[PDB]
Amino acid sequence: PKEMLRAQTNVILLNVLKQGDNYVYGIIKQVKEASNGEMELNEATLYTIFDRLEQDGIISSYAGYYRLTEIGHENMRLAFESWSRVDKIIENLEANKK
Amino acid sequence: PKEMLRAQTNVILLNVLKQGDNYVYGIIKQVKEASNGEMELNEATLYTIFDRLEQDGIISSYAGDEGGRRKYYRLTEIGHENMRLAFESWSRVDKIIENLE
Numbered sequence: 043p044k045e046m047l048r049a050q051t052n053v054i055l056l057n058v059l060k061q062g063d064n065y066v067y068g069i070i071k072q073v074k075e076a077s078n079g080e081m082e083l084n085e086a087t088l089y090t091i092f093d094r095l096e097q098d099g100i101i102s103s104y105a106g107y108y109r110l111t112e113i114g115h116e117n118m119r120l121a122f123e124s125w126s127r128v129d130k131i132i133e134n135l136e137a138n139k140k
Numbered sequence: 141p142k143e144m145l146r147a148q149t150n151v152i153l154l155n156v157l158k159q160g161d162n163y164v165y166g167i168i169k170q171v172k173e174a175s176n177g178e179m180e181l182n183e184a185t186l187y188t189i190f191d192r193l194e195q196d197g198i199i200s201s202y203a204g205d206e207g208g209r210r211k212y213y214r215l216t217e218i219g220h221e222n223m224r225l226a227f228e229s230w231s232r233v234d235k236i237i238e239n240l241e
């Protein structure tokens with residue numbers, strides 16, 4: 043579901059800017075590497091995908107290039123915390139056995 | 141945000157049905173327990189969520205005896221496929237991140 047791809051993409055992006063400030067191609071590469079070629083990145087598509095995040099306010103663009111914002115780190119710390127809880131809830135359902 | 145909560149709610153409900161066919165009261169009980177009390181779902185929320193999932197052929201429903209006659213919900217063939225996919229692709233994302241160290 044295209045809905046759920048873009049979800050998965052954004053998280054890869056953000057986890058890259060997390061590790062350091064990076065630019066289009068330097069991101070693609072790092073993903074290519076880390077995916078083990080597995081992640082066919084797309085030069086045409088990272089436009090729209092990076093506007094909506096600066097537009098939302100989680101990402102900044104300075105000239106040499108992108109950085110993770112005050113907000114940004116929060117909205118992940120949130121998401122990673124809440125989804126981790128969900129993992130534990132799912133373990134306990136497997137443990138409830140029902 | 142609202143979008144994410146309802147998403148997280150969709151996952152927990154589907155994982156509930158994965159561990160076995162189940163009815164509304166049973167699900168909410170089993171979710172209260174699993175969430176140590178943090179998570180208490182109302183019938184009405186559930187019904188609207190299940191309404192879309194039946195309508196997209198993800199789950200379906202049937203009557204079963206015992207109590208009295210209850211409405212049971214089950215993961216459909218397609219349901220099972222989507223969770224496998226979801227779980228697989230998400231497990232990939234997880235390792236990729238790791239290889240950003």
Ligand SMILES: CCN1/C(=C/C2C(=O)C(/C=C3/N(CC)c4ccccc4C3(C)C)C2=O)C(C)(C)c2ccccc21
Binds near residue numbers: 049231
């Ligand atoms: C992180 C943001 N995110 C989401 C994240 C996650 C996520 O993480 C996740 C499922 C996981 N699973 C599947 C059980 C596992 C399993 C083991 C370790 C970690 C995970 C994670 C990655 C948390 C999932 O779905 C989803 C649901 C796609 C989502 C929808 C809409 C907007 C954002 C968003």
Ligand code: NI
Binds near residue numbers: 109110111112
């Ligand atoms: Ni930053």
Ligand code: NI
Binds near residue numbers: 060110
């Ligand atoms: Ni930083």
Ligand code: NI
Binds near residue numbers: 215217220
């Ligand atoms: Ni089945």
Ligand code: NI
Binds near residue numbers: 215220
């Ligand atoms: Ni089944």
